[PDB]
Design an enzyme around this catalytic site. Structure first.
Site, PDB file in Angstrom:
ATOM      1  N   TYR A   5       6.103   0.062   0.908  1.00  0.00           N
ATOM      2  CA  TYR A   5       4.864   0.110   0.137  1.00  0.00           C
ATOM      3  C   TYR A   5       4.377   1.533  -0.171  1.00  0.00           C
ATOM      4  O   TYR A   5       3.406   1.709  -0.897  1.00  0.00           O
ATOM      5  CB  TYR A   5       3.752  -0.631   0.873  1.00  0.00           C
ATOM      6  CG  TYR A   5       3.809  -2.135   0.812  1.00  0.00           C
ATOM      7  CD1 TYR A   5       3.714  -2.895   1.983  1.00  0.00           C
ATOM      8  CD2 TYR A   5       3.924  -2.806  -0.415  1.00  0.00           C
ATOM      9  CE1 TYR A   5       3.744  -4.289   1.942  1.00  0.00           C
ATOM     10  CE2 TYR A   5       3.967  -4.195  -0.475  1.00  0.00           C
ATOM     11  CZ  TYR A   5       3.875  -4.940   0.712  1.00  0.00           C
ATOM     12  OH  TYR A   5       3.901  -6.330   0.665  1.00  0.00           O
ATOM     13  N   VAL A  47       5.734  12.577   6.655  1.00  0.00           N
ATOM     14  CA  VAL A  47       5.352  12.095   7.976  1.00  0.00           C
ATOM     15  C   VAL A  47       5.539  10.584   8.159  1.00  0.00           C
ATOM     16  O   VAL A  47       5.307  10.062   9.256  1.00  0.00           O
ATOM     17  CB  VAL A  47       3.907  12.523   8.374  1.00  0.00           C
ATOM     18  CG1 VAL A  47       3.706  14.039   8.168  1.00  0.00           C
ATOM     19  CG2 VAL A  47       2.889  11.731   7.607  1.00  0.00           C
ATOM     20  N   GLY A  48       5.960   9.893   7.095  1.00  0.00           N
ATOM     21  CA  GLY A  48       6.154   8.451   7.143  1.00  0.00           C
ATOM     22  C   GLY A  48       6.623   7.818   5.850  1.00  0.00           C
ATOM     23  O   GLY A  48       6.234   8.227   4.744  1.00  0.00           O
ATOM     24  N   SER A  49       7.434   6.779   5.987  1.00  0.00           N
ATOM     25  CA  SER A  49       8.007   6.120   4.819  1.00  0.00           C
ATOM     26  C   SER A  49       8.011   4.598   4.984  1.00  0.00           C
ATOM     27  O   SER A  49       7.900   4.091   6.090  1.00  0.00           O
ATOM     28  CB  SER A  49       9.420   6.657   4.551  1.00  0.00           C
ATOM     29  OG  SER A  49       9.917   6.155   3.329  1.00  0.00           O
ATOM     30  N   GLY A  50       8.118   3.868   3.884  1.00  0.00           N
ATOM     31  CA  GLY A  50       8.058   2.416   3.950  1.00  0.00           C
ATOM     32  C   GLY A  50       8.152   1.815   2.576  1.00  0.00           C
ATOM     33  O   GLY A  50       8.098   2.527   1.586  1.00  0.00           O
ATOM     34  N   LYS A  81      -0.769   9.808   0.690  1.00  0.00           N
ATOM     35  CA  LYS A  81       0.076   8.625   0.550  1.00  0.00           C
ATOM     36  C   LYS A  81       0.403   8.393  -0.906  1.00  0.00           C
ATOM     37  O   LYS A  81      -0.485   8.214  -1.733  1.00  0.00           O
ATOM     38  CB  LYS A  81      -0.657   7.419   1.111  1.00  0.00           C
ATOM     39  CG  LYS A  81       0.121   6.105   1.220  1.00  0.00           C
ATOM     40  CD  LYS A  81      -0.811   5.011   1.807  1.00  0.00           C
ATOM     41  CE  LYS A  81      -0.264   3.605   1.638  1.00  0.00           C
ATOM     42  NZ  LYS A  81      -1.103   2.574   2.406  1.00  0.00           N
ATOM     43  N   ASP A 120      -5.281   1.867   8.647  1.00  0.00           N
ATOM     44  CA  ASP A 120      -4.113   1.017   8.569  1.00  0.00           C
ATOM     45  C   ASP A 120      -3.018   1.785   7.890  1.00  0.00           C
ATOM     46  O   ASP A 120      -3.071   2.043   6.684  1.00  0.00           O
ATOM     47  CB  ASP A 120      -4.387  -0.277   7.816  1.00  0.00           C
ATOM     48  CG  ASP A 120      -3.336  -1.335   8.078  1.00  0.00           C
ATOM     49  OD1 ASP A 120      -2.140  -1.026   8.257  1.00  0.00           O
ATOM     50  OD2 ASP A 120      -3.711  -2.510   8.109  1.00  0.00           O
TER      51      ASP A 120
HETATM   52  N1  LIG Z   1      -4.426  -4.850   3.058  1.00  0.00           N
HETATM   53  C1  LIG Z   1      -4.074  -4.636   1.801  1.00  0.00           C
HETATM   54  O1  LIG Z   1      -3.494  -5.473   1.125  1.00  0.00           O
HETATM   55  C2  LIG Z   1      -4.437  -3.287   1.219  1.00  0.00           C
HETATM   56  C3  LIG Z   1      -4.117  -2.156   2.179  1.00  0.00           C
HETATM   57  C4  LIG Z   1      -2.798  -1.703   2.280  1.00  0.00           C
HETATM   58  C5  LIG Z   1      -2.544  -0.661   3.167  1.00  0.00           C
HETATM   59  C6  LIG Z   1      -3.588  -0.104   3.910  1.00  0.00           C
HETATM   60  C7  LIG Z   1      -4.933  -0.518   3.844  1.00  0.00           C
HETATM   61  N2  LIG Z   1      -5.916   0.032   4.597  1.00  0.00           N
HETATM   62  N3  LIG Z   1      -6.848  -0.793   5.224  1.00  0.00           N
HETATM   63  C8  LIG Z   1      -7.597   0.097   5.911  1.00  0.00           C
HETATM   64  C9  LIG Z   1      -8.789  -0.323   6.717  1.00  0.00           C
HETATM   65  C10 LIG Z   1      -9.600   0.577   7.397  1.00  0.00           C
HETATM   66  C11 LIG Z   1     -10.607  -0.125   8.029  1.00  0.00           C
HETATM   67  C12 LIG Z   1     -10.648  -1.538   7.902  1.00  0.00           C
HETATM   68  S1  LIG Z   1      -9.300  -1.986   6.904  1.00  0.00           S
HETATM   69  C13 LIG Z   1      -7.227   1.426   5.754  1.00  0.00           C
HETATM   70  C14 LIG Z   1      -6.127   1.351   4.896  1.00  0.00           C
HETATM   71  N4  LIG Z   1      -5.291   2.307   4.393  1.00  0.00           N
HETATM   72  C15 LIG Z   1      -5.060   3.456   5.033  1.00  0.00           C
HETATM   73  O2  LIG Z   1      -5.586   3.718   6.102  1.00  0.00           O
HETATM   74  N5  LIG Z   1      -4.238   4.319   4.448  1.00  0.00           N
HETATM   75  C16 LIG Z   1      -3.777   5.516   4.930  1.00  0.00           C
HETATM   76  C17 LIG Z   1      -3.286   5.677   6.249  1.00  0.00           C
HETATM   77  C18 LIG Z   1      -2.776   6.911   6.670  1.00  0.00           C
HETATM   78  C19 LIG Z   1      -2.696   7.997   5.788  1.00  0.00           C
HETATM   79  C20 LIG Z   1      -3.156   7.828   4.486  1.00  0.00           C
HETATM   80 CL1  LIG Z   1      -3.114   9.158   3.285  1.00  0.00          CL
HETATM   81  C21 LIG Z   1      -3.669   6.596   4.075  1.00  0.00           C
HETATM   82 CL2  LIG Z   1      -4.275   6.377   2.422  1.00  0.00          CL
HETATM   83  C22 LIG Z   1      -5.316  -1.604   2.616  1.00  0.00           C
END
Ligand SMILES: NC(=O)Cc1cccc(-n2[nH]c(-c3cccs3)c/c2=N\C(=O)Nc2cccc(Cl)c2Cl)c1
Length: 348
Positions: free
Chosen positions: A31, A26-29, A49, A164
């Site tokens: 990271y 459903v998505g790629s990138g 992910k 995110d």
């Molecule tokens: N920022 C960085 O360096 C680390 C970093 C890198 C990438 C994402 C994130 N954050 N930050 C938040 C937040 C939610 C609320 C306040 S912040 C949520 C989140 N990840 C997902 O939602 N993942 C996610 C999104 C869609 C599907 C799946 Cl399966 C996953 Cl897992 C932290």
């Protein structure tokens, strides 16, 4: 330890517990990449992910540790939570891949603002949930920084989660031109004005609210400067009180070159909006970030009278972010991550 099975999906190798069935990309990138799947154990449609080379650099290792910590901490109805986290690895020595499992989101708020007709009641409920989620995030001194329609999951019942979904680097190229990556950003963060705080998120909510009301991007600048101009035209050029707080001399100096402009009449921008929506917008979209309404403050605003409930708008447990100031090796970030994977406890 479950059995894991292997499957290639777009030249990526996926190795997942058997409970996760029917993987579809459903998505790629750069990271990572995400798949929809069905979790035979819970009966839930899930997103999974896979982090791409999570420990290839120090920044990568820390980013993987960071996401995991964030995700393990978030336990709120309006914020993405972690259903599961796994690795095929049997030991720390083996450990090289991290998979994160959350509830599957069908629609984002984009797949709502375009064509789907929004009542003021819908806008109320949608923004209320964003604010209720933000209150919780900010109470833990967590700043989203990248609030925008694509980072908001919304179901058929209009229930909402902040997440995110960034799989991408966030480069200079990505912030450049006529791009939705920049449209929701607080000016101080878009232009590196100063050290920013959690109210950057409130600016974003204001941009989102406006767009929900009008069905149009509030500040669709063709670049950083043009966007600044769109903003200043609405909210007025800054006075001397605010200029002092721009700690960037070059930023300060450019912004003084601009023809002075008054704050506009929002009633004349958001024609026919509920005056309480207009009011709330005027308090979110303030140039000086010290004077923006907070999430906690905004929940109590008359605009949300139908949804507001102070006994059901909880704060977060304490969030230790001391790792952020810490200087570790890849292997140390990796073992930290490993520990967090091992110790995950799924929700009830
Ligand atoms: N920022 C960085 O360096 C680390 C970093 C890198 C990438 C994402 C994130 N954050 N930050 C938040 C937040 C939610 C609320 C306040 S912040 C949520 C989140 N990840 C997902 O939602 N993942 C996610 C999104 C869609 C599907 C799946 Cl399966 C996953 Cl897992 C932290």
């Amino acid at each position: 330890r479950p059995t894991f099975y292997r499957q290639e999906l777009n030249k990526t190798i996926w190795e997942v517990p058997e409970r996760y069935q029917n993987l579809s990309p459903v998505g790629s990138g750069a990271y990572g990449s995400v798949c929809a799947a069905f979790d035979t154990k819970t009966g839930l449609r899930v997103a999974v992910k896979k982090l791409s080379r999570p420990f290839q650099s120090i920044i990568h290792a820390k980013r993987t540790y960071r996401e995991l910590r964030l995700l393990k901490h978030m336990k709120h109805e309006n914020v993405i939570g972690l259903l599961d986290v796994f690795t095929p690895a049997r030991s720390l020595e083996e450990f090289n891949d991290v998979y994160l499992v959350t509830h599957l989101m069908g629609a984002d708020l984009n797949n709502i603002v375009k064509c789907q007709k929004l009542t003021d009641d819908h806008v109320q409920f949608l923004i209320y949930q964003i604010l209720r989620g933000l209150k919780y995030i900010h109470s833990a001194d967590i700043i989203h920084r990248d609030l925008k329609p694509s980072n908001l999951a919304v179901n058929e019942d209009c229930e909402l989660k902040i997440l995110d979904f960034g799989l991408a680097r966030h480069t200079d190229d990505e912030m450049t031109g006529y791009v939705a990556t920049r449209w929701y950003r607080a000016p101080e963060i878009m232009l590196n004005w100063m050290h920013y705080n959690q109210t950057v998120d409130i600016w974003s909510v204001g941009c989102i609210m406006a767009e929900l009301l009008t069905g149009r991007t509030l500040f669709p600048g063709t670049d950083h400067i043009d966007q600044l101009k769109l903003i200043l035209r609405l909210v007025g050029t800054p006075g001397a009180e605010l200029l002092k707080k721009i700690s960037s001399e070059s930023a300060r100096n450019y912004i003084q070159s601009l023809t002075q402009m008054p704050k506009m009449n929002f009633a004349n921008v958001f024609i026919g909006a509920n005056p309480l929506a207009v009011d709330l917008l005027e308090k979110m979209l303030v140039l000086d970030s010290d004077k923006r309404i907070t999430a906690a403050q905004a929940l109590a605003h008359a605009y949300f009278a139908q949804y507001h409930d102070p006994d059901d708008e909880p704060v977060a447990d304490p969030y230790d972010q001391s790792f952020e100031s810490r200087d570790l090796l890849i292997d140390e970030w990796k073992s930290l991550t490993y520990d967090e994977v091992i110790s995950f406890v799924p929700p009830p």
